[PDB]
Amino acid sequence: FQGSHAMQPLGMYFPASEYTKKMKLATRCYISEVLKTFADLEHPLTNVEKNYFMEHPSFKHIYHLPSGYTHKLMGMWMLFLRTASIEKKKEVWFVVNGVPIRYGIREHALISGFNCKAYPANYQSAGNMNFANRYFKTGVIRREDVKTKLMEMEPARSKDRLRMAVLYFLTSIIAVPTKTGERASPIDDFCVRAASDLTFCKTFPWGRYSFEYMLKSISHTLDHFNGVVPNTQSPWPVPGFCVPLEFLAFEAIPSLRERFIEEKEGSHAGCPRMCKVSFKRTEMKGFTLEQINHVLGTTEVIESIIREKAEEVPLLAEITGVEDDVDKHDVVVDSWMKRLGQGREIRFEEVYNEDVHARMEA
DNA sequence: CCAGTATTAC
DNA sequence: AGTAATACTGG
Ligand SMILES: [Zn+2]
Known part of the structure; x- marks a missing residue:
């Protein structure tokens, strides 16, 4: 289609030789564990405690996910x-x-529903160490120490x-x-202070925060592999809220969506994408790379920027800003x-051919 | 056997 | 701390 041309990227992180190399990816996004821990507390959660989460502007959507949530990577x-190797730092392509x-903050919001508005002024000063100092000795607080303390605390007035x-x-x-286990890494210091202030925690853009954390994991992952995928059974961790990334390819590519995604009946059309769809079950715990590659086939039907639907416009308006943040x-x-603004699509024929060849003919 | 996962070892 | 290896889970 006639129109302004799209330039090819200055580089890619991996050559097409690597498109068939599988890898075990370890998530750090304990949705199933947290929900199970909450349901199994010997002293059950109170109505106020349960509604804090079930009515939380962002985190209510974690409850619209299937029980025993298992990531598919x-x-x-x-x-x-x-x-692609690009100059922007606040979005990945x-x-x-x-x-x-x-994958930008808009897409992160469209799929998760988490608040992705701008950070409030001097948000880093929120909360204080008073709450944590009441329960944890000075030193390192591990994720498991918080879980253990939660299960060993007695519900009461405060x-x-x-x-x-x-x-x-x-x-x-x-x-x-x-890192987990006896020498698990210290949990995020801002979260430790922020948790002291339940009102702040209800309004803070945790969508932006999880998005920026996921951007870090992406960069660390790409640096780690440095263009080559090893032949190994050792898993590589990609920590953080990875649900938007797990679903992004399926939302943008109809051939993948049709074969691997199904509508979640009962879902509200006002919800984000993660509450309205679910992965179809297969004979394996997750889809294999070969399956994804094969269903990818020769399709040219791919949305560059996943398009919102009318029923989702109010949600996006509620959880995103009006203009995009400044970037490089x-x-x-x-x-x-x-x-894209002119209404034209983007497809580099040569890149398309290399992708198809790498996946289907060698 | 598999992909996702928890855990210890290097 | 950062990374790699082992082996379990629910099929
Ligand atoms: Zn929802």
Whole structure:
């Protein structure tokens, strides 16, 4: 279609030789564990405690997910293998079958429903160490120490138990440590202070915070592999709220959505995407890379920026800002947004051919 | 056997 | 701390 041209990316993180190399990816996003822990407390959660989470502006959507939530990661890996080298730092783009797909804060909000508005002024000063100092010796607080303390606390007049549950939720789902066990990494210091203030925790843009944390994991992952995927059974951790990334490829590519996604009946059309769809069950715990690659086939039907539906416009207006945040100057991405703005699609024929060849003919 | 996962070891 | 290896889970 005639129109302004999209420039090819200055580089890619991996060559197409790596598109068939599988990998075990370890998540750090303990949705199932947190929900199970909450349901199994010997002293059950109070109505106020339960409604804090079930009515939380962001975290209410974690309850619209299937029980025993299990992440499926080969869609994300397929995208990771096609990450473009760009100048922007606040968004990532993946080139599938020659078509750039964007993971920005808007997409993170559309799928999660989490508040992705701008940070309030001097948010880093929120809360204080008083609450944590009431329950943890000076030193390192591990994610498991918060879980243990939560299960060993007695519900009573003060909301300290609710604060602990909030801390557990934040540091298991939103900003989550990689290392576990006896020497587990210290949990996020901001979350420890923020959990002291339940009102602040209800309004803070945890969508932006989880998004920025996921951007860090993406960069660490790409640096780690440095262009080559090893032949190993050792899993690589990609910590943080990865649900938008797990579903992104399926939401942007109809061939994948049709074969691997099903509508979640009972869901409200006002909810974000994660509450309205679910992965179809297969004979395996997750989809294999070969399955994703095969269903990818030769399709050219791919949305660069996943489009919202009418029933979702109020939600996005409620959880996103009006203008995009300032980022580094990026003439390549600029050319993409120009061509997309004119109503034209983007597909680099050569890149498309290499993707198809790498997946289906060698 | 598998992909996702929890846990210890290097 | 950062990373890698082992082996369990629910099929
Ligand atoms: Zn929802």
